[PDB]
Design a binder for this molecule. Structure first.
Ligand SMILES: CCCCCCCCCCCCCCCCCC(=O)OC[C@H](COP(=O)([O-])OC[C@H](O)COP(=O)([O-])OC[C@H](COC(=O)CCCCCCCCCCCCCCCCC)OC(=O)CCCCCCCCCCCCCCCCC)OC(=O)CCCCCCCCCCCCCCCCC
Ligand SMILES: CCCCCCCCCCCCCCCCCC(=O)OC[C@H](COP(=O)([O-])OCC[N+](C)(C)C)OC(=O)CCCCCCCCCCCCCCCCC
Ligand SMILES: CCCCCCCCCCCCCCCCCC(=O)OC[C@H](COP(=O)([O-])OCC[N+](C)(C)C)OC(=O)CCCCCCCCCCCCCCCCC
Ligand SMILES: CCCCCCCCCCCCCCCCCC(=O)OC[C@H](COP(=O)(O)OCCN)OC(=O)CCCCCCCCCCCCCCCCC
Ligand SMILES: CCCCCCCCCCCCCCCCCC(=O)OC[C@H](COP(=O)(O)OCCN)OC(=O)CCCCCCCCCCCCCCCCC
Ligand SMILES: CCCCCCCCCCCCCCCCCC(=O)OC[C@H](COP(=O)(O)OCCN)OC(=O)CCCCCCCCCCCCCCCCC
Ligand SMILES: *C(=O)CCCCCCCCCCCCC
Lengths: 459, 155, 65, 128, 122, 177, 558
């Protein structure tokens, strides 16, 4: 994995020694070269994972999240370069350095052989994201979110730390490869119940869980575009990756500890999708859509069937691409009308036809139009949860109505109807913006041809 | 925008009510808030819940599709009462009379299909008769076992 | 030359559209009368429907006891 | 005589059949004139900015900004936990969760009992 | 259609129910009753790929008609008489079903008048 | 009720609007033209029976139960004109009504495709920008204290000036682009 | 063999080639609608050869040509099922679409987005022939959602209009409620039968198949506008006329009926599914035909016509006669597409006038349109030996002579009378009588595009029932023995409907003004069903989506 970490670190002398008009071009070029390099991780096997060293490994779960992570950096550099034009050059290089450092943390978070190195890199990803959100977020009003981050630290990552140190003392190792063969059944006891909550609640907030999703339509709103792209595309999926690693140790107690949280997600995707029908803020609507889609990944991990893991990792990759494109479309209107109000600028297909085509395609991938991998992930999760319980199809299908309903409403409000009269700064689409939409959508459409590379280790 | 045009807490004194009605750009007599039960509406005006479909269409609107003006204090559920959504418009038939006619019609048709399923109509014939032991090997019978003889006779 | 718009009076007609409309109306009634002359049973009936009461007890096997 | 129209929540009374529309009193003249005055003043304040050539951008509507700030920001700092808020946050907050919990637990206990008694037709069920 | 009124408005005791009948033996009233001959062989209608609803006691006319329909392509109006033969023998099969129904109705009339004669006599 | 110029409906306007809506809903009830024309003169007679009513309170009550008559006898789906609101072709071409300022955002290679049009559009915009400050200083001295009472605007008074708030009414899109 | 599968795939690739043409464009087109119409004409000619060599031998096959995915026991391959249903539906759909596009080159000539319109209409055709040729549930779900989304995009064609967007989102809502049941069926077959392929479903032949058939009946309810999920098909007349002609009369709306005809070996061994299909179809064909009696927009009346015919299709599936239902689909396409084309020819001639109360006097003004509208109405009602006689009457000849729900049969006959009632209502208010349109006559139809486009579907509406029903093989046994009052049922009920509606129409010339009855207010406001549920079910959602979901729980308590 050291053929990826070292070029990502060499992006730091590349971004600090570059000429002042060249720092976007150079970082975009070399991060696209790293993303082309990232396809060497597709050397996967039907029995063995790709095990590089004592520190790094890659099965077919971590590999597509790595490719999506290394692909997300050039797109963030394209998306965030317009609204940093009047920024200081040194502050602009600090922004690019925090993006590069976040990629550096993520690409060795997903490959972490041992679980406390996963914990260190997992909680290391929060700091450059925090600095990007609070130094370039264009407004900061976080009176209620401070107490929620305190709740995240109390109920989340610290019990995970104590639990992983406990497994280190009990099993003697936290290597996931060793824990594949030295796993003991975790029986019914109160010690094992608090053990399960400690191993799971950090990743429950990171997904997020319904009821615990209070941070996500704030942190998505108060962020720049690169921060919202990396939150929607990668930083939610650390929770799902960590659940799919840590549920190896949590058998068979998961088979009766999943029942509350499954309810919290199965009803929760009914609520948040419905919440998207009453959103004034477009970026908040995409945030609650992200909650409504990660609820299915929570259910699919907690029911731990093969079809559910295949659908959950396909849904993670697909929703990463789709929701990142949705935030980029929301920014491509916000950079013109200077307000996130979804009822402000209407009828935009009269003014921007190709951009409305991109809105249509991102909406159709948002509502899981087949054969897109949004639908493949959605569908396999629905099949596995039907095998879990035959009634849940109702709570699936009703969600699959409301998921359609706000997806086209977001299309109908922003793009259709009568244009707003008093807005006359609606410029034509820059080639940068259309390139950003295409570099989201065309990989998402090409993955419908060959979905087997995004269906996880047990395809 | 600045603070003294933003919403605040519930108006208790009448001068705070007057300051809000000047802030929300409407008459003080029309300005009523949502009742302070603690549901978090604040000092927002309780508009009388009229859908935007009901408005004057021929009026020169600032927002013609919304049927809404500039500076007008909008309804709280303005995203809900757009003409793509929930309407409250008057109908030619009464609301309860519509609900009664629909429920009586649907339940009576359900009951009549239950009556017709209770008493089915048919033809004055016997059952359809098939050769070769009611087509035993055709309908998936095993070749080693032999069923009872299903023999039909001329008439 | 096209059909000129007219005002409060009967519009201009082409000979071709009138003879085509009369031709397809004649085609409809020709095909109806033709298949009614040759089939005459898809509308009226293919075979005689027998009377059940007009059947004797010997062919149906009713011994009077 | 005639069937009187019944108003509803989703069927409002018409403007023609409302009696207070037929008020002729001078205080209704004052109220209607003040509403026309506020509406005309706001219309003028709008379309002086709207028809301005030197402005190229968005005529910002503080009623719309105020509406979005009410729908987003003003929700927590004007909350008071009382009987009504706690009972309504306990009805629709932990009600249907408990409902679907007992429904799905009942069906899964039934299915598990049928599987461990050899009853459920799990013949061609090898995808799961 | 009058028998629907006879079974619903009248009594269902004398009217033969559609679902399970004959309730009488086939030899009851018939001295030396013969079976129904099948003309087309089981393997012959197996190779002709006939529908399981269509493999009744007169499927051999259907086999001749479908062979004519295959052999007369494209002249799709050249085999009207083979269709007429198949439709006429299906009509006769329906007539035999009507005869079974009238047999069952008249034997239920025999049972009804038998028990009424027994109640009058004894 | 809700009007741009008046704050209310006069009783004369209410009578005329109820007569018009009654005839329209009647024509919806009474499809054929001679039949509607017969019932239309009958209804005109019914409206002219109490045309000469001096008592405005009695005329108010008569108008009120006339509204009840019209509501009791209304058609459920009255004939709406196609480009009237509620019609089948209503606001159909609003997706084709591009605002004029978008011509400012064209590329010069396609602005040069229509040279006379944009060469005239330059002096249209010139006319607008040298008319704007004159019509603003026209409106600021005629508007009473407290803002304007009614939404109606004064016309161009001097010769050479243009009427105030005129650019979006003149340069509005065509109804069939 | 090598001819059949080759031309089968050549038809679909040929339909996809103008999509690559419109996507790889730099110039302004040398009549791209003519290019798409020429392509679909040649695709019709191409698909004629596999149909003829199916009528020769009965040659069916499967083309599982491209392996796509293997989820551990489920090999999802790109698999095309060429059976009787594809071999009869593909030439009918291509012929109807070819006439609709030669219609659209006249009707949609003023639209500057004409290339986008023909692109979207070709995308619909591609997704629909993906639907009707799919061999597994996944490719069928691809075509299913494809015709749903192209329905959205072609209802909301005038996207500035609020009502078009509203009707398009309404249609998406009801179709996704049907998709709940479709995904229920896919879930049941994957768990209990380990397949989405039709062949393993049919070969395993499950017995406890009530739940997947309830899922399929809910899918056909969402798709074919059955009762409960019906009003989007009358709402969907807000799109253009060739949209409502091709998609929402003849091609898309038969796909729920086609989904239930496709699964006939499961329905023929489940009497409960047959009874539910019979009851739902009789309810829909009663209700929509009753609503059609008192409407005044001609597109609404012909949409209620096609939804009542879909309810009759559901009825004749529910008597376990699926092949008669599919013959009725192939029959119904011709005259119902032609009726929408003639209605839209009246609409475009009378300057966007759609309300029948401002029409009339068009017997001699538009002679060819009047001729074809009368022929389409008589094919709809069941005139003897038009195309609609060769299926629909047989439907009644199997609805009487079967073990049937009696009230479903009686409502089927009431629907059969109502078809004649609204057909002669259209001919009365639109063709007969004296004019009612405004004074500036711009009435014209003398374009060879319009005349030939109505002419080829006119040849279809005259001869196609005879040709198809003498070219299709027997798959059931036709019940041909019945009493004379039972053989003459459908014709007599249709003529009674004509007589009753002629008396109704001749009561309108009288100089009397009656107060509206409760039956008129019920049927004119659409059984009160789009008036209540379109207000109540959004309300109870959206307040619950704001008060308790957003504000109470997910901003304050949690
Ligand atoms: C590895 C090699 C592979 C080669 C094959 C390619 C595989 C797929 C690649 C991507 C396909 C989409 C590309 C175009 C869309 C994005 C750009 C766009 O909008 O352009 C508009 C523009 C045309 O419009 P315009 O009028 O010029 O301007 C825009 C208008 O102003 C305003 O626009 P508008 O409203 O007028 O029109 C927009 C219209 C709007 O139409 C719709 O929204 C309708 C779409 C939904 C319904 C119909 C489809 C339903 C599903 C069935 C079909 C799929 C399965 C088929 C298989 C058999 C059955 C199972 O969209 C289209 O027409 C797009 C056609 C393709 C749609 C694909 C499905 C999108 C729906 C969402 C996902 C669905 C599931 C996933 C599908 C995955 C397919 C592989 O297109 C172009 O200019 C083309 C640009 C170049 C495209 C290159 C494509 C390849 C890129 C990959 C590069 C790497 C590999 C090398 C291959 C190179 C090949 C040349
Ligand atoms: C998330 C909410 C729960 C977090 C609990 C705190 C982290 C626990 C991490 C796991 C530790 C562990 O091994 O537990 C088993 C151990 C069991 O003790 P032990 O493992 O030393 O005992 C020897 C083994 N047996 C049980 C067989 C005798 O649990 C504890 O010692 C206490 C666990 C609860 C901690 C209470 C304080 C924190 C309360 C919640 C704060 C949030
Ligand atoms: C003008 C364009 C045409 C090209 C002109 C220039 C070339 C001249 C023509 C000759 C072409 C070359 C020879 C033939 C092609 C190669 C044949 C071959 O074996 O190829 C290997 C394979 C055949 O499959 P396979 O079975 O060998 O291998 C599958 C791969 N594994 C086993 C790993 C899973 O691929 C192809 O043939 C690719 C073409 C497929 C065509 C259809 C694509 C549809 C895409 C839809 C995406 C979504 C699907 C969703 C639905 C799925 C089902 C429900
Ligand atoms: C609030 C934010 C939004 C929501 C996010 C989630 C927050 C809550 C997270 C925990 C959810 C509930 C706890 C998990 C329930 C799992 C099943 C369970 O514990 O059932 C209740 C238990 C039944 O008894 P039993 O399970 O048999 O106990 C013996 C165990 N060996 O009953 C009992 O034993 C009686 C009760 C004892 C107290 C248990 C306290 C610990 C659990 C909560 C922490
Ligand atoms: C064979 C079995 C048959 C079984 C039958 C019984 C089950 C089904 C019961 C019926 C369900 C559907 C009917 C209720 C919802 C209909 C919503 C709808 O269509 O709204 C349309 C409405 C606009 O309609 P309209 O008034 O005509 O507009 C033109 C002029 N304004 O548009 C709007 O107002 C916009 C509203 C947008 C937001 C919609 C919110 C409501 C969402 C409803 C989801 C329903 C999910 C059901 C799941 C069932 C699972 C089993
Ligand atoms: C098909 C066969 C049609 C001809 C046989 C039926 C004749 C019949 O009963 O027609 C009833 C009726 C004519 O009688 P009526 O309208 O009351 O009197 C004025 C006469 N011009 O009305 C008609 O003739 C008009 C309806 C004819 C329906 C034809 C399609 C079925
Ligand atoms: C007994 O009546 C057998 C016929 C089938 C059941 C009754 C059907 C009655 C309606 C059809 C005939 C209508 C004739 C005008």
């Amino acid at each position: 994995m050291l053929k990826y970490i070292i070029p990502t670190m060499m992006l730091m002398p590349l971004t600090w020694l570059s000429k002042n008009s060249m720092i976007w071009i150079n970082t975009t070029l070399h991060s696209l070269l790293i993303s082309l390099t990232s396809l060497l991780l597709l050397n996967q096997f039907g029995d063995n994972s790709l095990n590089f060293s004592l520190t790094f490994f890659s099965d077919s779960l971590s590999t597509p999240l790595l490719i999506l992570t290394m692909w997300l950096l050039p797109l963030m550099l394209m998306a965030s370069q317009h609204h940093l034009s009047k920024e200081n050059l040194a502050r602009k290089k600090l922004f690019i350095s925090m993006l590069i450092l976040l990629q550096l943390f993520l690409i060795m978070t997903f490959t972490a052989t041992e679980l406390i190195f996963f914990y260190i890199m997992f909680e290391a990803t929060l700091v450059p994201t925090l600095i990007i959100i609070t130094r370039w977020g264009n407004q900061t009003e976080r009176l209620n979110a401070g107490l929620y981050f305190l709740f995240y630290t109390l109920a989340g990552s610290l019990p995970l730390l104590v639990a992983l140190i406990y497994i280190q003392n009990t099993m003697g190792s936290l290597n996931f490869l060793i824990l594949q063969y030295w796993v003991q059944p975790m029986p019914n006891s109160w010690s094992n119940t608090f053990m399960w909550l400690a191993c799971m609640m950090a990743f429950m907030v990171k997904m997020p869980l319904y009821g615990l999703h209070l941070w996500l339509p704030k942190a998505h709103v108060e962020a720049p575009i690169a921060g919202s792209m990396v939150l929607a595309a990668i930083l939610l999926k650390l929770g799902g990756y960590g659940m799919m690693r840590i549920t190896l140790l949590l058998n068979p107690i998961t088979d009766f500890m999943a029942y509350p949280f499954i309810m919290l997600s199965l009803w929760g995707m009914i609520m948040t999708s419905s919440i998207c029908l009453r959103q004034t803020d477009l970026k908040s609507l995409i945030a609650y859509s992200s909650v409504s889609h990660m609820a299915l990944v929570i259910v699919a991990i907690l029911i731990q069937t093969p079809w559910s893991y295949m659908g959950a990792t396909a849904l993670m990759i697909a929703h990463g691409l789709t929701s990142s494109m949705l935030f980029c479309l929301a920014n491509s209107n916000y950079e013109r009308v200077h307000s996130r109000t979804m009822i402000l600028a209407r009828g935009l297909q009269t003014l921007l036809p190709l951009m409305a085509a991109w809105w249509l395609l991102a909406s159709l991938t948002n509502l899981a139009l087949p054969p897109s991998i949004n639908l493949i992930g959605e569908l396999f999760v629905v099949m596995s949860t039907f095998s879990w319980s035959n009634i849940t199809i109702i709570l699936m299908g009703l969600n699959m109505v409301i998921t359609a309903l706000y997806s086209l409403y977001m299309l109908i409000t922003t793009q259709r109807g009568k244009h707003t009269h008093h807005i006359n700064n609606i410029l034509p689409s820059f080639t940068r913006e259309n390139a950003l939409m295409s570099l989201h959508m065309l990989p998402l459409l090409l993955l419908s041809l060959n979905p087997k590379i995004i269906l996880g280790p047990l395809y | 925008i600045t603070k003294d045009m933003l919403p605040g807490p519930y108006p208790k004194t009448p001068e705070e009510r007057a300051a809000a009605a000047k802030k929300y750009n409407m008459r003080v007599e029309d300005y009523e808030p949502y009742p302070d039960d603690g549901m978090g509406y604040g000092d927002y005006p309780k508009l009388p819940d009229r859908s935007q479909q009901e408005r004057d269409p021929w009026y020169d609107w600032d927002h013609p599709d919304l049927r809404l003006n500039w500076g007008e204090p909008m309804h709280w559920d303005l995203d809900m009462y757009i003409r793509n959504r929930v309407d409250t418009s008057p109908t030619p038939v009464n609301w309860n009379l519509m609900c009664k006619h629909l429920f009586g019609f649907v339940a009576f048709m359900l009951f009549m299909f239950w009556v017709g399923e209770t008493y089915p109509t048919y033809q004055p014939v016997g059952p359809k008769q098939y050769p070769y032991n009611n087509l035993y090997l055709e309908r998936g019978g095993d070749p080693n076992k032999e069923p009872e003889p299903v023999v039909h006779y001329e008439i | 030359a096209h059909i000129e718009p007219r005002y409060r009076q009967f519009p201009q007609l082409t000979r071709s559209q009138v003879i085509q409309a009369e031709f397809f109306s004649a085609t409809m009634w020709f095909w109806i009368l033709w298949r009614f002359w040759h089939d005459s049973d898809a509308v009226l009936g293919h075979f005689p429907y027998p009377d059940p009461s007009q059947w004797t007890d010997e062919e149906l096997g009713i011994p009077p006891d | 005589s005639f069937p009187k129209y019944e108003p509803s929540r989703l069927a409002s009374l018409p403007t023609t059949l409302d009696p207070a529309e037929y008020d002729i009193s001078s205080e209704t003249r004052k109220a209607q004139a003040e509403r026309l005055a506020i509406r005309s003043r706001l219309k003028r304040e709008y379309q002086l900015q709207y028809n301005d050539p030197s402005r190229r951008g968005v005529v910002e509507d503080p009623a719309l900004i105020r509406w979005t700030c009410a729908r987003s920001a003003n929700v927590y700092p004007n909350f008071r936990p009382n009987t009504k808020t706690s009972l309504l946050g306990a009805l629709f907050g932990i009600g249907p969760l408990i409902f679907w919990y007992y429904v799905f637990k009942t069906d899964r206990d039934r299915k598990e009992k049928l599987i461990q008694e050899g009853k459920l037709d799990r013949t061609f069920n090898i995808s799961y | 259609g009058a028998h629907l009124a006879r079974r619903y408005l009248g009594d269902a005791s004398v009217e033969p129910e559609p679902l399970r009948m004959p309730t009488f033996p086939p030899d009851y009233g018939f001295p030396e009753r013969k079976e129904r001959e099948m003309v087309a062989t089981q393997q012959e209608m197996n190779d002709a790929q006939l529908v399981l609803q269509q493999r009744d006691y007169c499927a051999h006319y259907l086999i001749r008609f479908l062979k004519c329909k295959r052999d007369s392509f494209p002249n799709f109006l050249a085999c009207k008489h083979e269709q007429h033969d198949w439709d006429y023998c299906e009509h006769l099969d329906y007539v035999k079903r009507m005869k079974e129904f009238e047999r069952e109705r008249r034997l239920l009339q025999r049972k009804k008048r038998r028990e009424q004669r027994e109640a009058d006599m004894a | 009720a809700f009007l741009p110029s008046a704050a209310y409906l006069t009783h004369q306007q209410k009578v005329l609007q109820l007569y018009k809506r009654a005839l329209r809903h009647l024509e919806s009830r009474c499809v054929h033209r001679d039949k509607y024309r017969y019932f239309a003169c009958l209804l005109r007679a019914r409206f002219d029976e109490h045309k000469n009513e001096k008592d405005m309170v009695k005329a108010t009550q008569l108008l009120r139960e006339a509204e009840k008559e019209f509501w009791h006898g209304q058609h459920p789906q009255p004939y709406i004109f196609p480009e009237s609101p509620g019609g089948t072709s209503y606001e159909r071409y609003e997706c084709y009504k591009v605002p004029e300022w978008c011509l400012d955002d064209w590329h010069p290679s396609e602005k040069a495709m229509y040279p006379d049009y944009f060469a005239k559009r330059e002096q249209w915009k010139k006319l607008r920008r040298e008319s704007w400050e004159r019509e603003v200083k026209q409106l600021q001295e005629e508007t009473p204290v407290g803002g304007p009472r009614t939404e109606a605007l004064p016309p161009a008074r001097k010769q050479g000036d243009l009427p105030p708030l005129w650019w979006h009414i003149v340069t509005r899109p065509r109804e069939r682009p | 063999m090598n001819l059949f599968s080759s031309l089968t795939l050549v038809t679909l690739i040929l339909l996809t080639m103008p999509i690559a043409a419109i996507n790889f464009n730099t110039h302004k087109f040398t009549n791209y609608p003519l290019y798409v119409k020429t392509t679909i004409s040649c695709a019709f000619i191409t698909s004629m050869i596999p149909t003829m060599m199916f009528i020769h031998t009965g040659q069916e096959m499967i083309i599982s040509n491209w392996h796509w995915l293997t989820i551990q026991t489920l090999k999802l391959s790109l698999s095309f099922k060429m059976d009787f249903f594809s071999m009869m539906f593909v030439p009918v759909a291509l012929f109807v679409t070819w006439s609709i596009m030669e219609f659209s080159m006249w009707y949609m000539h003023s639209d500057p987005n004409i290339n986008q319109f023909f692109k979207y209409l070709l995308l619909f055709l591609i997704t629909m022939l993906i639907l009707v040729t799919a061999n597994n549930l996944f490719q069928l779900f691809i075509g299913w959602e494809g015709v749903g989304i192209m329905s959205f995009l072609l209802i909301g064609w005038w996207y500035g209009r609020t009502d078009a967007n509203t009707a398009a989102l309404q249609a998406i809502l009801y179709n996704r409620i049907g998709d709940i049941g479709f995904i229920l069926a896919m879930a049941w077959f994957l768990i209990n039968l380990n397949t989405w392929d039709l062949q393993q479903i049919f070969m395993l032949n499950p017995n406890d198949s009530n739940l997947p058939l309830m899922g399929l009946i809910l899918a056909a309810t969402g798709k074919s506008a059955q009762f409960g999920l019906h009003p989007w098909l009358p709402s969907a007349m807000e799109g253009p006329t060739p949209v409502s002609a091709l998609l929402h009369s003849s091609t898309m709306v038969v796909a729920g009926i086609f989904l239930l005809i496709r699964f006939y070996p499961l329905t023929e061994n489940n009497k409960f599914g047959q009874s539910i299909m019979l009851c739902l179809g009789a309810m829909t064909t009663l209700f929509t035909a009753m609503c059609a009696l008192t409407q005044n927009d001609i597109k609404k009346i012909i949409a209620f016509s096609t939804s009542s015919q879909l309810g009759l299709m559901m009825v004749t599936i529910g008597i376990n006669q699926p092949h008669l239902a599919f013959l009725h689909i192939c029959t119904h396409a011709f005259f119902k597409a032609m009726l929408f084309m003639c209605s839209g020819s009246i609409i475009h001639s009378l300057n966007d006038e759609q309300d029948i109360r401002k029409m009339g006097g068009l017997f001699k003004a538009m002679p060819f349109t009047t001729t074809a509208l009368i022929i389409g109405s008589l094919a709809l009602t069941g005139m003897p030996f038009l195309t609609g006689f060769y299926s629909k009457d047989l439907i009644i000849e199997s609805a009487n002579t079967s073990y049937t729900n009696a009230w479903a049969l009686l409502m089927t006959l009431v629907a059969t009378s109502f078809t004649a009632i609204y057909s002669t209502r259209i001919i009365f208010f639109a063709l007969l009588g004296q004019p009612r349109f405004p004074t500036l006559i711009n009435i014209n139809e003398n374009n060879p595009f319009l005349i030939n486009s109505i002419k080829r579907l006119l040849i279809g509406s005259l001869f196609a029932g005879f040709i198809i029903s003498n070219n299709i093989p027997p798959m059931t046994i036709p019940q041909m023995t019945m009493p004379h009052y039972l053989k003459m049922t459908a014709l007599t009920v249709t003529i009674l409907g004509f007589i009753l509606a002629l008396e109704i129409s001749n009561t309108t010339h009288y100089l009397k003004f009656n107060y509206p009855s409760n039956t008129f207010k019920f049927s004119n406001l659409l059984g009160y069903y789009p008036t209540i549920m379109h207000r109540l079910t959004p309300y109870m959602n959206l307040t619950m989506s704001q008060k308790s979901a957003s504000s109470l729980l997910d901003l304050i308590w949690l």
